[PDB]
Structures are given as structure tokens and as C-alpha cells.
Amino acid sequence: TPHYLWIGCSDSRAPAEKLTNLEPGELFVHRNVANQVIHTDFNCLSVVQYAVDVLKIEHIIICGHTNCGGIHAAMADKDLGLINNWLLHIRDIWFKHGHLLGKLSPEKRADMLTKINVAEQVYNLGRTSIVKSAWERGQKLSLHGWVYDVNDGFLVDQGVMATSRETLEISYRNAIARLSILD
Amino acid sequence: TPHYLWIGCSDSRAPAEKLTNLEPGELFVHRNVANQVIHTDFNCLSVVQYAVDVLKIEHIIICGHTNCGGIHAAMADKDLGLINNWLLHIRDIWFKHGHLLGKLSPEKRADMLTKINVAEQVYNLGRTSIVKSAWERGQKLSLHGWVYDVNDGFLVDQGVMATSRETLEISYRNAIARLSIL
Amino acid sequence: TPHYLWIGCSDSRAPAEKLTNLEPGELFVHRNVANQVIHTDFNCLSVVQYAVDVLKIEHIIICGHTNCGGIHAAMADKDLGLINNWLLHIRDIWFKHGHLLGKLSPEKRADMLTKINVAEQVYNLGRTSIVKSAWERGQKLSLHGWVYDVNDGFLVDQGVMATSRETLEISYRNAIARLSILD
Amino acid sequence: TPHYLWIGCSDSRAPAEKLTNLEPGELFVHRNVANQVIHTDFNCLSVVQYAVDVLKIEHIIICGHTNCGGIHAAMADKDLGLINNWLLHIRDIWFKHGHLLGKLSPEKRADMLTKINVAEQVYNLGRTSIVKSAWERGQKLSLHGWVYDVNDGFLVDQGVMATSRETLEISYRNAIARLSIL
Ligand SMILES: [Zn+2]
Ligand SMILES: [Zn+2]
Ligand SMILES: [Zn+2]
Ligand SMILES: [Zn+2]
Known part of the structure; x- marks a missing residue:
């Protein structure tokens, strides 16, 4: 019976069982x-x-990845139809961090947004009433945020990792801080 | 660049890339x-x-599977919380085919509901505005609904296939009529 | 502070406070x-x-009404776009009861579907984990299903009324039975 | 046949037909x-x-209101269940304007968040595919975001109005810059 939850992209460029x-x-x-x-x-x-x-x-894992079309279509103007509505949550993230991303070379922005997005989704995840509740009642649970690089077939832990709500805040905020300030 | 869309269950052992x-x-x-x-x-x-x-x-493929925790949780009267609201859609389907399912040995009922389900999800897929308009404007699109078993593999009763709204009805209705023959 | 929940149509042809x-x-x-x-x-x-x-x-009230565009567009073929998806739940109800409605004069079908739909939505409502849970823990709660006739400005109780899950089943099933068998 | 769409809150005393x-x-x-x-x-x-x-x-009007239980429940750290997930969207908005809101007297904070909210909901409304395409194809459509108070009535700071994606930015950004002047 399953011991992990994998939340991944429909691009599913990896086999989750290989990576894990x-x-x-x-x-x-x-x-x-x-x-x-x-x-x-x-x-x-x-x-x-x-x-x-x-x-x-x-253990819940949000795994994002490079060369993701959702990430790309989020950054693109183009009205693609209903999928724009779903991707507007990512556009909101795109502009939330527009200073970081502006400072960035246009060609490194997709890679960076992919990362930011993983961190933000782990943050959403850890604020759900479900996960917070699990924690308050002593249930053991850890959230993780990974990114698969499709161009060299490697995972990267994104230093986003929570086993409580305090630890969520600490690693989220620290993850954004590094992404924002470091080269 | 992808050529197929696979709609599967969160339970199912065997990811799409292994089955295909x-x-x-x-x-x-x-x-x-x-x-x-x-x-x-x-x-x-x-x-x-x-x-x-x-x-x-x-091509879109909805793949269902036998011994599926959702199907089983749909059938149980258990207060599991939020997930029950998601599964109420499967219980509507159960109620809609209650007569058929009531005829079967209780041990055969989960396998039937699993197959009925794929048939209903392909029927829903094929009535979405997105798919009808694709067909309306002449874009080639095939819907398929299969059921997988760990032991037997894919059940050679297959079931549903649609390349239009009209083939959708024929295929849906026959699949239900066929599953009714016991 | 509020003592009722009104679940109504966006057509909102009545003032809920007048009717109640x-x-x-x-x-x-x-x-x-x-x-x-x-x-x-x-x-x-x-x-x-x-x-x-x-x-x-x-007290939760689902109030439906006559000359509703949702009900009409549900019965109509026409691809109207995204709203079709939302109305497909009503089309499913339309065909669930296709024998009743077929027996009906084409001009009385909308009136009838409006009713069936109210009954079905009270049934959905009473099967939610929220409402069932409220009941199991002794919370006092009653679901009601009404229809406003826009052409003569009158409410009609639809005999759908539940204060438990057993009473939900009894009045739902009885409501459909009358609607199905009576002229 | 209707001519306006009103998006309001489930709390708010005063239905649209009374306010208008x-x-x-x-x-x-x-x-x-x-x-x-x-x-x-x-x-x-x-x-x-x-x-x-x-x-x-x-014309679409998003109407917010002061002394609103949603806004207040958004701000509280209370485990109220499912509704908290709905309100997490308001808490994102709070966090997005945290600096502004942190400047205000705590007693003035709910009124600010209520106004910021209407401004953000009109900004979301106006970026939906449905509204952009309406404008794109030349269909006349005006978005409005107002805040109602039981005592003062409608606050004559009004706020947002959009008749295009371009008027949407100007109006959104100015409304935020304006609400920042304390
Ligand atoms: Zn992807
Ligand atoms: Zn399953
Ligand atoms: Zn209506
Ligand atoms: Zn309110």
C-alpha cells in the first residue's frame, strides 16, 4: 500500500518510480x-x-521540471483558451517575483520560474486545512519540492521541505530569499 | 512532443509508460x-x-483498473471526509446502474462498476465543449476507455471508442447494453 | 446574524427576503x-x-424557479461555450428522467425539469459530507426545496424536506415518484 | 432580460436590488x-x-462590503475547515499588501483589505479568457469594483473600472497606489 504522494506535471517527462x-x-x-x-x-x-x-x-512530493509547457505558456501572452485560466495562478507567481525575474537573462527565466513555482506550490500545500490539521494532531507528514532537469536527467532538491507549519515558513522564506538575492 | 493523453487513477500501480x-x-x-x-x-x-x-x-485514453481503492471507497458507507464528495459522482453512477449491479454476485460488483465507470467517464469526456468543438471543426480526435487488471491485463471486452458525438452514443449505449448481458 | 442559507439562481427573479x-x-x-x-x-x-x-x-433553502435560462439552455442543443459544462449536470438529470419528460407535452417540460432539478439538488446537498456530518453529531439542520413561479409570483414547496439522511431519502424518493407517475 | 452582472458576498445584508x-x-x-x-x-x-x-x-460589478465575515475570517488564524481553503486566496492578497496593511492601525485593517480585495477581484475578472476575448472581439464590456458600508453607503473613493485590458492596468495600479497614500 502506498507510502508516498507524488504531485507532478502532466508532461510527466520522468517515471516517478525511477526518480524516487x-x-x-x-x-x-x-x-x-x-x-x-x-x-x-x-x-x-x-x-x-x-x-x-x-x-x-x-511524504508528499511536488516535482516540477524544466522544459515544461505550462511554465512556458504561463510566461507567454497568447490566448490559448481555458488553460489560460488555470495558468493565471502561475502568472500571478511570475509577477509576484518580477524583480528577480527581470534581473534575469530572458533565457534563464523559465528555469527560474519552474523553481519558484515548485516552492510556491509546496507553500500552498502546507497551508491546506488538511495538512495543517494532520500536523496539529501529531500525524507524521513531510512535504518536499523537487525539480527534474529534463536536459540532464537529474533531480534537484529545492531546499523546500516541511514537517510542520513553522518549518514550512522557515524553508519557504529561505528558498525565496536565495532565489531572489543570489546570482 | 506528446501524441496521447492518458487519464488514469491515482491508485493504479503501473504508470502509463509501463502499461503502454x-x-x-x-x-x-x-x-x-x-x-x-x-x-x-x-x-x-x-x-x-x-x-x-x-x-x-x-487520442485520449481513459484507463480504469480493477481492485481500485476509489471504486471500493465509493461503494462503502464510510465517512472519510472531503474525498467522499469527490466519489459521490461514482455513487450516482452506481445508482444509475443499480438494477444491473444488484443482479450480480456482490463479489463481481466492483469489477462491473469499474467498467461502467470508464464507460461513463468517456461519455462525459465526449460531451465536454472542448471535445465537441474539436470534432465540429473537423479536428481528428479518438476517445478510448479501457480497463486494466494486474493479472489478466487489459480486459478483451474493451469497451468504448468515439471519433464523433454520434459514434460516442453508439459506443456508449452498446457498451452498457453489452455489460448488461449476464 | 443569519439563521438561513438561500441557494438560488443567478436569474434571481425574486427578492429572497420577500419570499421568506x-x-x-x-x-x-x-x-x-x-x-x-x-x-x-x-x-x-x-x-x-x-x-x-x-x-x-x-435551515438551507434551494429555491428554483420558472422561466430559468439555465434550465432552458440545459434543454437546448446549441454550444454556448463554458456554460454547457456547468449545465451538463442538469442535462444528466434531463435524461435520467427522460421517460417522465417524454410523456410530457413539450411546453410543460421546462416547468417539470425546474422541479426535478430542485429535488435533485436538495438530494446532492443532503449527501454532502458537511450536512451528513452535521446530522450525525446531533446538529439541528433542515434542507428545503422550493420553486418560485415567475408568472404568478408564488412559492411552491416541493415536498422535498429533510432533517436527517433517512428523511432525505424518504422525501426525495417520494417526490420523484409523484413527479414520475402523476399527471 | 438582464443588463448587469453583480458579484457580491454571501454575508452582505442588502441584496443588489436594494442597493441599486x-x-x-x-x-x-x-x-x-x-x-x-x-x-x-x-x-x-x-x-x-x-x-x-x-x-x-x-456591465459587471463586483461589490465588496465593510464588516464582512469572509474578510474577517481570512484574517483570523482559526481552523474553520473547508472554508479556510476558500479564504486562502484572500490571505495571499493580505500577504501581497502586507507592508501597506502593516502600516495601518489594526482597527483600520479590515476596511483596507476589503477595498484591496475588490480591486484584486476586478483584476482577476478582467484577465479571465472570457472577458479578454470579449474585448478582443470588440464587444462593449465595463468592469466596476465598489465597496459598500452600512452607515456611509458607497465609499466615494470608489476604485476600479475597466473597459479594456489597458484601462484594467491603469485602473488597478492607480487604485493600489491611491490606497497606499496614508
Ligand atoms: Zn510540465
Ligand atoms: Zn484506482
Ligand atoms: Zn434561473
Ligand atoms: Zn461579506
């Missing part, structure tokens, strides 16, 4: 465009609630 | 509990829309 | 196209959860 | 907690789309 060094059925999996945890998405949140409360999964 | 002879790269994947296509689900409908309108994917 | 013989602020109000309670609509369900669990509202 | 000189009949109304237009909310976006594309409504 797991076999299938250990992994409970949700996937959407640009691996989002939206506060009021019933679909993702159901997944999380069932995993956390019913299955007692101890 | 397709790499990761050619598969665009959505997964949720009990592999649903709910009419008003922004999450899944955004995957479908992006797949069809933008990536120009020409 | 209430003043504003007694009424907590949600409105959408064709007064739906969809199982996985986060928007409506939030409204209900906040009303039931935080505000301790004792 | 419009009958019921001319108003199409959506109400949710803290009068939100969330990018991915099928419920509200279906009202907007039907209003704009089908009913051809030419």
Missing part, C-alpha cells in the same frame, strides 16, 4: 498542468485528503 | 481518484483542453 | 446558474460548510 | 464568500461566461 527509486504502488500519483496545488482545486485537494487522512501517507 | 509501449515524452498524463472526468472539474478539463486545442493530441 | 418573509442579514445567500449543488463545486460547498459548521445555520 | 435602483429582472447575481473571482472557479466563471457571451451583459 521506488516501484509502482508505493507511489500515489496526481498530475496536472505545471504541478499546481491550487487552494480551491477540489481535484488535487481530494487526492491530498484521501492520501493524508485515509491512507496515512507520510 | 510509449515512452514518457509521448504521453501527457492526468491522474485523479477513480479516473474521473467530472463536467465542472477545472483541473481535468484544463488538461483536456490544453491537450486537444494546443498540443493537438489526437 | 425575512429582512436581509437573516439570510446567507449563494447564487449560481440553475441553483445547483454540485458534489465537487468548492464554491457552493464552502458556502454550505461555513454556514453549517461556523455560523450554525439551521 | 434596478429591479430584480435586470440583475444577474452571483454571490460567494468575500465576493471572489478565483481564476479556476467553475461556479463563478460559468456565471461570467453565460452573462457575457450569451446574455450579452455589458
Whole structure:
């Protein structure tokens, strides 16, 4: 029975079981465009609630990745239709950090947004009533935010990692600080 | 650049790339509990829309599976919280085929509901505005609904396939009539 | 502070406070196209959860009405765009009861669907984990399903009324039975 | 046949028809907690789309209100359940204007957040695909964001108005810059 929840992108350029060094059925999996945890998405949140409360999964992983079309279409003007609405949550993140990204060479922005987005989604995840509740009642649970680089097939931990609400705040804020200030 | 969209279940052992002879790269994947296509689900409908309108994917496959925790949780009268609201859609489906399902041995009922489900999710998929308009404007698009078993593999009753709204009805209705023959 | 939740149509052809013989602020109000309670609509369900669990509202009213455009567009072919997706829940209800409605004169079908829909939405409402939970813990709560006739300005109770899950089943099933079998 | 769409809050005393000189009949109304237009909310976006594309409504008004239970529940650290997830969107907004709000006397903070909110919901409304395409294709459409008070009535700082994506930026940004002047 599964011990992990993988929240990944529908691009699914990796096999989650390879990257996690797991076999299938250990992994409970949700996937959407640009691996989002939206506060009021019933679909993702159901997944999380069932995993956390019913299955007692101890580890949730948001894995983002490079050369993601959601990330690219988020940065692009183009009216693509309904998917724009879903990607507007990422555009909001794009402008939230517009100073960092402006300072950036246009060609390194997608890589950077991919990262920022993973951090932000782990932050959304750790603020859900589900996860906070699990923590308050002593349930063991850890959130993780990874990025797969499609161009060299490597994972990178993004230093975003929470086992409580205080630890969420500490590593989120520190992650954004590095991303914002470091070269 | 991907050529297929796979709608699967969050439980299912066996990811799309293992079940298929397709790499990761050619598969665009959505997964949720009990592999649903709910009419008003922004999450899944955004995957479908992006797949069809933008990536120009020409085949969508809804894959259900036997021994599925969603299907089983749908059937139980358990207060599991938020997830029950998601699964109420599967319980509507159960109630809609209650007569058929009531006829079966209780041990055969989960396998039936799993197959009925794929059939209903392909019927929902195929009535979305996104898919009808694709067809309306002449874009090639095939919907498929399959059920996977760990032991037997893919059940050679297959089921649903649609290349239009008209083939959608025929295929849906026959699949239900066929599953009713016991 | 409010003692009722009104779930009504965005057509809002009535003033809810007139119909309920209430003043504003007694009424907590949600409105959408064709007064739906969809199982996985986060928007409506939030409204209900906040009303039931935080505000301790004792009465939820789903009020439907005649000459509703949601009901009409549900019955119509026409691809209107995104609203079709929302109205597909009503089309499903339209075909669920296609034998009743077929037996009907084409001009009385909209009136009938309006009614069926109110009954079905009270049924969805009473199956939500929120409302069922409220009941299991002894909370006092009653669901009601009304229809306003715009052409003569009258309410009609639809005999759909639940104060538990057993009473939900009894009046729902009886409501459909009358609608199905009676002239 | 309606001519206006009103997006209001489920709390607010005073329905649209009382606040306005419009009958019921001319108003199409959506109400949710803290009068939100969330990018991915099928419920509200279906009202907007039907209003704009089908009913051809030419004015949308988001009306917020002072002494609003959503705004207040957003600010509290209370575990109220599902509703907190809905309100996390308001808390993002709080965090986004934290510096401004941190400057104010705590007793003035709820009124500010209420006004900031309407400004952000009009900004979301105006970036939906439905509204941009309406404008793109030349259809006349005006977005308005007002805040109501039980005592003072409508606050004559008004705020946002958009008849295009360009007027949307100007109006949004100025409204925020203006509310920052203390
Ligand atoms: Zn991706
Ligand atoms: Zn499953
Ligand atoms: Zn109506
Ligand atoms: Zn309010």
C-alpha cells in the first residue's frame, strides 16, 4: 500500500518510480498542468485528503521540471483558451517575483520560474486545512519540492521541505530569499 | 512532443509508460481518484483542453483498473471526509446502474462498476465543449476507455471508442447494453 | 446574524427576503446558474460548510424557479461555450428522467425539469459530507426545496424536506415518484 | 432580460436590488464568500461566461462590503475547515499588501483589505479568457469594483473600472497606489 504522494506535471517527462527509486504502488500519483496545488482545486485537494487522512501517507512530493509547457505558456501572452485560466495562478507567481525575474537573462527565466513555482506550490500545500490539521494532531507528514532537469536527467532538491507549519515558513522564506538575492 | 493523453487513477500501480509501449515524452498524463472526468472539474478539463486545442493530441485514453481503492471507497458507507464528495459522482453512477449491479454476485460488483465507470467517464469526456468543438471543426480526435487488471491485463471486452458525438452514443449505449448481458 | 442559507439562481427573479418573509442579514445567500449543488463545486460547498459548521445555520433553502435560462439552455442543443459544462449536470438529470419528460407535452417540460432539478439538488446537498456530518453529531439542520413561479409570483414547496439522511431519502424518493407517475 | 452582472458576498445584508435602483429582472447575481473571482472557479466563471457571451451583459460589478465575515475570517488564524481553503486566496492578497496593511492601525485593517480585495477581484475578472476575448472581439464590456458600508453607503473613493485590458492596468495600479497614500 502506498507510502508516498507524488504531485507532478502532466508532461510527466520522468517515471516517478525511477526518480524516487521506488516501484509502482508505493507511489500515489496526481498530475496536472505545471504541478499546481491550487487552494480551491477540489481535484488535487481530494487526492491530498484521501492520501493524508485515509491512507496515512507520510511524504508528499511536488516535482516540477524544466522544459515544461505550462511554465512556458504561463510566461507567454497568447490566448490559448481555458488553460489560460488555470495558468493565471502561475502568472500571478511570475509577477509576484518580477524583480528577480527581470534581473534575469530572458533565457534563464523559465528555469527560474519552474523553481519558484515548485516552492510556491509546496507553500500552498502546507497551508491546506488538511495538512495543517494532520500536523496539529501529531500525524507524521513531510512535504518536499523537487525539480527534474529534463536536459540532464537529474533531480534537484529545492531546499523546500516541511514537517510542520513553522518549518514550512522557515524553508519557504529561505528558498525565496536565495532565489531572489543570489546570482 | 506528446501524441496521447492518458487519464488514469491515482491508485493504479503501473504508470502509463509501463502499461503502454510509449515512452514518457509521448504521453501527457492526468491522474485523479477513480479516473474521473467530472463536467465542472477545472483541473481535468484544463488538461483536456490544453491537450486537444494546443498540443493537438489526437487520442485520449481513459484507463480504469480493477481492485481500485476509489471504486471500493465509493461503494462503502464510510465517512472519510472531503474525498467522499469527490466519489459521490461514482455513487450516482452506481445508482444509475443499480438494477444491473444488484443482479450480480456482490463479489463481481466492483469489477462491473469499474467498467461502467470508464464507460461513463468517456461519455462525459465526449460531451465536454472542448471535445465537441474539436470534432465540429473537423479536428481528428479518438476517445478510448479501457480497463486494466494486474493479472489478466487489459480486459478483451474493451469497451468504448468515439471519433464523433454520434459514434460516442453508439459506443456508449452498446457498451452498457453489452455489460448488461449476464 | 443569519439563521438561513438561500441557494438560488443567478436569474434571481425574486427578492429572497420577500419570499421568506425575512429582512436581509437573516439570510446567507449563494447564487449560481440553475441553483445547483454540485458534489465537487468548492464554491457552493464552502458556502454550505461555513454556514453549517461556523455560523450554525439551521435551515438551507434551494429555491428554483420558472422561466430559468439555465434550465432552458440545459434543454437546448446549441454550444454556448463554458456554460454547457456547468449545465451538463442538469442535462444528466434531463435524461435520467427522460421517460417522465417524454410523456410530457413539450411546453410543460421546462416547468417539470425546474422541479426535478430542485429535488435533485436538495438530494446532492443532503449527501454532502458537511450536512451528513452535521446530522450525525446531533446538529439541528433542515434542507428545503422550493420553486418560485415567475408568472404568478408564488412559492411552491416541493415536498422535498429533510432533517436527517433517512428523511432525505424518504422525501426525495417520494417526490420523484409523484413527479414520475402523476399527471 | 438582464443588463448587469453583480458579484457580491454571501454575508452582505442588502441584496443588489436594494442597493441599486434596478429591479430584480435586470440583475444577474452571483454571490460567494468575500465576493471572489478565483481564476479556476467553475461556479463563478460559468456565471461570467453565460452573462457575457450569451446574455450579452455589458456591465459587471463586483461589490465588496465593510464588516464582512469572509474578510474577517481570512484574517483570523482559526481552523474553520473547508472554508479556510476558500479564504486562502484572500490571505495571499493580505500577504501581497502586507507592508501597506502593516502600516495601518489594526482597527483600520479590515476596511483596507476589503477595498484591496475588490480591486484584486476586478483584476482577476478582467484577465479571465472570457472577458479578454470579449474585448478582443470588440464587444462593449465595463468592469466596476465598489465597496459598500452600512452607515456611509458607497465609499466615494470608489476604485476600479475597466473597459479594456489597458484601462484594467491603469485602473488597478492607480487604485493600489491611491490606497497606499496614508
Ligand atoms: Zn510540465
Ligand atoms: Zn484506482
Ligand atoms: Zn434561473
Ligand atoms: Zn461579506
